Write an enzyme that holds these catalytic residues in place. Structure first.
Site, PDB file in Angstrom:
ATOM      1  N   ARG A 207      45.951 -72.637  20.256  1.00 54.65           N
ATOM      2  CA  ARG A 207      46.402 -71.477  19.549  1.00 54.65           C
ATOM      3  C   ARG A 207      45.082 -70.661  19.241  1.00 54.65           C
ATOM      4  O   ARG A 207      44.039 -70.984  19.036  1.00 54.65           O
ATOM      5  CB  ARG A 207      47.183 -71.848  18.149  1.00 54.65           C
ATOM      6  CG  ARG A 207      48.601 -72.145  18.708  1.00 54.65           C
ATOM      7  CD  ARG A 207      49.588 -72.088  17.394  1.00 54.65           C
ATOM      8  NE  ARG A 207      49.451 -70.706  16.788  1.00 54.65           N
ATOM      9  CZ  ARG A 207      49.685 -70.569  15.239  1.00 54.65           C
ATOM     10  NH1 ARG A 207      49.918 -71.228  14.580  1.00 54.65           N
ATOM     11  NH2 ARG A 207      49.375 -68.908  15.235  1.00 54.65           N
ATOM     12  N   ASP A 232      49.368 -76.257  12.656  1.00 58.96           N
ATOM     13  CA  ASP A 232      48.105 -75.901  11.580  1.00 58.96           C
ATOM     14  C   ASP A 232      47.635 -77.182  10.953  1.00 58.96           C
ATOM     15  O   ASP A 232      46.429 -77.199  10.975  1.00 58.96           O
ATOM     16  CB  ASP A 232      48.425 -74.847  10.785  1.00 58.96           C
ATOM     17  CG  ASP A 232      48.460 -73.437  11.609  1.00 58.96           C
ATOM     18  OD1 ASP A 232      47.457 -73.030  11.692  1.00 58.96           O
ATOM     19  OD2 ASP A 232      49.581 -72.843  11.844  1.00 58.96           O
ATOM     20  N   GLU A 498      45.243 -62.318   6.440  1.00 56.02           N
ATOM     21  CA  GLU A 498      44.575 -62.053   7.683  1.00 56.02           C
ATOM     22  C   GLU A 498      44.235 -60.718   8.032  1.00 56.02           C
ATOM     23  O   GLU A 498      44.971 -60.082   8.010  1.00 56.02           O
ATOM     24  CB  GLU A 498      45.087 -63.025   8.832  1.00 56.02           C
ATOM     25  CG  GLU A 498      45.126 -64.217   8.705  1.00 56.02           C
ATOM     26  CD  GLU A 498      46.412 -65.108   9.525  1.00 56.02           C
ATOM     27  OE1 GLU A 498      47.490 -64.435   9.928  1.00 56.02           O
ATOM     28  OE2 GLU A 498      46.362 -65.994  10.262  1.00 56.02           O
ATOM     29  N   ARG A 514      47.726 -58.769   7.528  1.00 50.72           N
ATOM     30  CA  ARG A 514      49.183 -59.100   7.234  1.00 50.72           C
ATOM     31  C   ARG A 514      49.504 -59.378   5.734  1.00 50.72           C
ATOM     32  O   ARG A 514      48.571 -59.376   4.911  1.00 50.72           O
ATOM     33  CB  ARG A 514      48.887 -60.691   7.862  1.00 50.72           C
ATOM     34  CG  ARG A 514      50.303 -61.593   7.753  1.00 50.72           C
ATOM     35  CD  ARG A 514      50.007 -62.818   8.216  1.00 50.72           C
ATOM     36  NE  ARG A 514      51.072 -63.959   8.214  1.00 50.72           N
ATOM     37  CZ  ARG A 514      51.020 -65.258   8.760  1.00 50.72           C
ATOM     38  NH1 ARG A 514      49.965 -65.470   9.554  1.00 50.72           N
ATOM     39  NH2 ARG A 514      52.050 -66.124   8.553  1.00 50.72           N
ATOM     40  N   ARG A 576      58.437 -63.335  16.034  1.00 52.24           N
ATOM     41  CA  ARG A 576      57.077 -62.990  16.497  1.00 52.24           C
ATOM     42  C   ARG A 576      57.460 -62.824  18.204  1.00 52.24           C
ATOM     43  O   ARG A 576      57.332 -63.594  18.789  1.00 52.24           O
ATOM     44  CB  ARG A 576      55.867 -64.217  16.555  1.00 52.24           C
ATOM     45  CG  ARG A 576      55.805 -64.341  14.956  1.00 52.24           C
ATOM     46  CD  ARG A 576      54.505 -65.506  14.822  1.00 52.24           C
ATOM     47  NE  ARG A 576      53.965 -65.189  13.572  1.00 52.24           N
ATOM     48  CZ  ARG A 576      53.267 -66.286  12.910  1.00 52.24           C
ATOM     49  NH1 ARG A 576      52.648 -67.307  13.621  1.00 52.24           N
ATOM     50  NH2 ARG A 576      52.664 -66.172  11.756  1.00 52.24           N
ATOM     51  N   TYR A 609      50.033 -64.522  17.446  1.00 60.00           N
ATOM     52  CA  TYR A 609      48.765 -64.368  17.423  1.00 60.00           C
ATOM     53  C   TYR A 609      47.868 -63.715  18.621  1.00 60.00           C
ATOM     54  O   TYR A 609      48.145 -64.078  19.916  1.00 60.00           O
ATOM     55  CB  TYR A 609      47.608 -65.408  16.706  1.00 60.00           C
ATOM     56  CG  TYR A 609      47.896 -65.915  15.424  1.00 60.00           C
ATOM     57  CD1 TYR A 609      49.019 -65.751  14.776  1.00 60.00           C
ATOM     58  CD2 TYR A 609      46.553 -66.196  14.505  1.00 60.00           C
ATOM     59  CE1 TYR A 609      49.178 -65.942  13.510  1.00 60.00           C
ATOM     60  CE2 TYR A 609      46.721 -66.432  13.109  1.00 60.00           C
ATOM     61  CZ  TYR A 609      48.040 -66.550  12.646  1.00 60.00           C
ATOM     62  OH  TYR A 609      48.205 -66.845  11.528  1.00 60.00           O
TER      63      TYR A 609
HETATM   64  C1  LIG Z   1      49.091 -72.426   6.695  1.00 64.72           C
HETATM   65  C2  LIG Z   1      48.217 -71.626   5.881  1.00 64.72           C
HETATM   66  C3  LIG Z   1      47.975 -70.237   6.357  1.00 64.72           C
HETATM   67  C4  LIG Z   1      48.612 -69.278   5.272  1.00 64.72           C
HETATM   68  C5  LIG Z   1      47.446 -69.272   3.995  1.00 64.72           C
HETATM   69  O1  LIG Z   1      48.638 -70.061   7.545  1.00 64.72           O
HETATM   70  C6  LIG Z   1      47.927 -69.593   8.464  1.00 64.72           C
HETATM   71  C7  LIG Z   1      49.311 -68.969   9.410  1.00 64.72           C
HETATM   72  C8  LIG Z   1      49.063 -69.108  10.735  1.00 64.72           C
HETATM   73  C9  LIG Z   1      50.367 -68.602  11.526  1.00 64.72           C
HETATM   74  O2  LIG Z   1      51.321 -68.254  10.589  1.00 64.72           O
HETATM   75  O3  LIG Z   1      50.459 -68.887  12.721  1.00 64.72           O
HETATM   76  C10 LIG Z   1      48.022 -69.790  11.578  1.00 64.72           C
HETATM   77  C11 LIG Z   1      46.809 -69.838  10.769  1.00 64.72           C
HETATM   78  N1  LIG Z   1      45.677 -70.773  11.568  1.00 64.72           N
HETATM   79  C12 LIG Z   1      47.242 -70.548   9.268  1.00 64.72           C
HETATM   80  N2  LIG Z   1      45.860 -70.991   8.616  1.00 64.72           N
HETATM   81  C13 LIG Z   1      45.501 -71.984   8.227  1.00 64.72           C
HETATM   82  C14 LIG Z   1      44.302 -72.167   7.746  1.00 64.72           C
HETATM   83  O4  LIG Z   1      46.205 -73.136   8.397  1.00 64.72           O
END
Ligand SMILES: CCC(CC)O[C@@H]1C=C(C(=O)O)C[C@H](N)[C@H]1NC(C)=O
Length: 654
Positions: A207, A232, A498, A514, A576, A609
């Site tokens: 990913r 994640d 992000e 985001r 998505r 993503y």
């Molecule tokens: C899970 C925590 C975070 C929000 C703060 O979600 C993000 C969302 C993600 C997602 O929505 O796909 C992927 C990112 N890699 C993740 N970051 C981390 C560090 O885990």
């Protein structure tokens, strides 16, 4: 050897009867069907072929393979009188369109009475293999009298009518073996993968793609190699890399660039069923979410989140940086086994000090966070995973590391950021440096916004996007990367913010991010990131509240005589989905004319993503997650992160 083979059968939902051709061909009842097709219309549920009892009362007596308008490939096998109904599928199995043309896919099904499995292949990958207890082959279904291309005859009427061209279709009256059908389904879609399941990384999953073009003309990729499915957390994740010296035509075999070895980089068959897919690898130190930037001096940086083993990004303490301040310096804290307080620090040369006595110990920590005692490495046993998931010590010794479950000395269980530098455009990398406690001593580090950083042209300031959950954290350096600071910007709500940056004119930058409100936000700074305006929101993208990561880049060439930016994002409130690339043209007053957009595939297809880069030849590279990476239904899927390219002229269309 095929019992029937047909070609260039063009259909608009009406189908074609091949009963004469296929009746009396299926002795065992087992079968393999291989279909090379393209769809002229994705809408509704479409069967590539259907074998059925057509008679009235027998509408639930058929076998088929079907396509959905979200790109799911499945099959049914049903018998009416016994009320047995098998369905086997996988989401995000096929491609719809590409640059205005219907995409040729090749998919296959295998039904094996011995193993009682249905298997589905798409474009070189076995997308699913399922053992079923109520197994049905063609002979098991009562009174089969109708064999059809492009539909299923139910009660004398054509159902699930296919719209497109069956380019080639082959029926075999036996189960073909796994590798034969993988090779038969191999096509042009298969070559759009830079990272593939169980490649040189050893990972079945990936990913969080990132693309970047270096000044020498190399195109560089990084990505999450996620070994325990696509979670994640908790998971075992390494950052892998791969590059192209020919404008993306060909890519190097992936290397591990950031990685721990408390667990080995090995392929795991991660369960997708409802009752297994929530399983996780509990206890593995992790790098996650890469950010790339090239300095003015051509040195390359890469940042990543660092998570010690066991540490969930929601059980990570939020009021501890992991650092102490001693005589004005910052030193990472450590707790020794059996202590409750953190009594030790890493100081000069990696020497471990007892903070209580203020004396150096016999212990030290190396450049990779590995623990030594009197100059000799301490070891721990590495873990393996087997399936009913078990995690066990495998007999291999690796260095004891402060990021590990079994370390004698341990960091604060929180998240960190690390960066590595390369002087040879990513062929080799320095050891990781952990960022200082830029958010304060009593707060954890932010989380990186995956993609790229930027060098703001007027100041040379380096800017790395990150976030806290409540604030943007714009990490920067004003000394060519020697030292780091942060601009923390409170957001209107709890945004998973992000971000990526663009420069509009000198001194003027925008952070696009985001949000938790359904919209993409952008904040503007007119002093190269020092102060930021209140957020504004794009009017033409509308997403679910949880949001998705985006990519936006500056582009070197004028478009319609104007300086341009290029944005990639999903655009759909249903998930998505509905990937779009948008060209924004900058006006003299720094407003943007969002003049062009291009839909990557059909609107109900997966797009999560994404990452854009400008190629040396001024075409555009995109790598993206072609699935819904939020959905609990589209987890732990192989070979679903392709690379494609566009000309500007392509991106002008839609
Ligand atoms: C899970 C925590 C975070 C929000 C703060 O979600 C993000 C969302 C993600 C997602 O929505 O796909 C992927 C990112 N890699 C993740 N970051 C981390 C560090 O885990």
């Amino acid at each position: 050897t095929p019992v029937l083979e047909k070609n260039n059968v063009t259909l608009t939902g009406g189908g074609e009867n091949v009963t004469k051709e296929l009746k009396d061909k299926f002795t065992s009842g087992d079968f393999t069907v291989v279909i090379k097709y393209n769809q002229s219309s994705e809408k509704g549920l479409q069967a590539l072929f259907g074998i059925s009892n057509s008679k009235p009362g027998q509408q639930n007596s058929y076998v088929d393979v079907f396509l959905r308008d979200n790109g799911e490939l499945g099959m049914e096998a049903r018998d009416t009188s016994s009320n047995k109904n098998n369905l086997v599928s996988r989401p995000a199995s096929v491609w719809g369109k590409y640059k205005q043309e219907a995409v040729t896919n090749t998919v296959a099904v295998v039904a094996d009475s011995v193993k009682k499995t249905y298997s589905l292949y798409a474009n070189g990958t076995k997308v699913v293999e399922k053992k079923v207890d109520n197994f049905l082959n063609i002979k098991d279904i009562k009174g089969i009298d109708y064999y059809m291309l492009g539909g299923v005859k139910r009660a004398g009427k054509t159902a699930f009518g296919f719209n497109g061209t069956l380019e080639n279709i082959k029926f075999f009256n036996s189960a073909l073996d796994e590798e034969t059908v993988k090779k038969m389904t191999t096509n042009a879609v298969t070559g759009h993968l830079i990272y593939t399941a169980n490649d040189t990384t050893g990972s079945n999953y990936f990913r969080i793609p990132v693309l970047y073009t270096f000044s020498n003309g190399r195109v560089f990729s990084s990505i999450d190699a996620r070994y325990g499915g696509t979670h994640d957390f908790l998971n075992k994740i390494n950052i892998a890399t791969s590059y192209s010296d020919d404008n993306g035509k060909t890519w190097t075999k992936p290397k591990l660039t950031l990685a721990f070895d408390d667990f080995a980089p090995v392929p795991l068959e991660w369960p997708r069923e409802v009752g297994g897919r929530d399983l996780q690898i509990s206890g593995g130190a992790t790098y996650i979410d890469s950010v790339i930037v090239e300095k003015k001096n051509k040195q390359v940086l890469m940042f990543a989140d660092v998570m010690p083993a066991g540490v969930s990004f929601r059980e990570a303490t939020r009021k501890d940086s992991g650092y102490k301040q001693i005589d004005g310096n910052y030193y990472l804290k450590l707790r020794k086994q059996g202590d409750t307080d953190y009594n030790y620090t890493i100081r000069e040369n990696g020497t471990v000090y007892d903070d209580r006595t203020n004396r150096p110990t016999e212990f030290s920590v190396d450049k990779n966070f590995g623990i030594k005692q009197n100059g000799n490495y301490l070891t721990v046993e590495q873990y393996s995973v087997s399936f009913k998931k078990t995690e066990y010590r495998n007999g291999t010794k690796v260095h004891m590391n402060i990021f590990y479950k079994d370390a004698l000395f341990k960091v604060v269980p929180t998240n960190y950021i690390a960066y590595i530098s390369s002087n040879d455009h990513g062929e080799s990398w320095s050891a990781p440096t952990l960022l200082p406690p830029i958010m304060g001593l009593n707060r954890n580090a932010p989380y990186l916004g995956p993609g790229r950083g930027i060098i703001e042209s007027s100041t040379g300031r380096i800017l790395i996007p990150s976030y806290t959950g409540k604030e943007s954290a714009f990490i920067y350096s004003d000394d060519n990367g020697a030292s780091w600071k942060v601009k923390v910007v409170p957001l209107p709500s709890s945004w998973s913010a992000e971000a990526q940056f663009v420069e509009l004119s000198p001194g003027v930058i925008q952070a696009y991010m985001r949000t938790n409100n359904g919209k993409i936000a952008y904040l503007t700074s007119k002093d190269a990131g020092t102060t930021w305006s209140a957020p504004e929101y794009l009017k033409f993208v509308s997403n679910p509240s949880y949001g998705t990561q985006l990519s936006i880049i500056n582009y070197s060439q004028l478009i319609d005589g104007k300086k341009a930016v290029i944005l990639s994002t999903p655009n759909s409130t249903n998930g998505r989905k509905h990937g779009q690339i948008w060209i924004g043209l900058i006006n003299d007053d720094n407003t943007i004319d969002w003049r062009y957009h291009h839909d990557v595939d059909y609107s109900n297809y997966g797009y999560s993503y994404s990452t854009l880069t400008e190629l040396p030849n001024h075409e555009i590279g995109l790598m993206f997650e072609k699935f819904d990476s939020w959905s609990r239904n589209e987890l732990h899927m192989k070979n679903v992160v392709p690379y494609i390219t566009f000309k500007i002229e392509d991106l002008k269309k839609n």
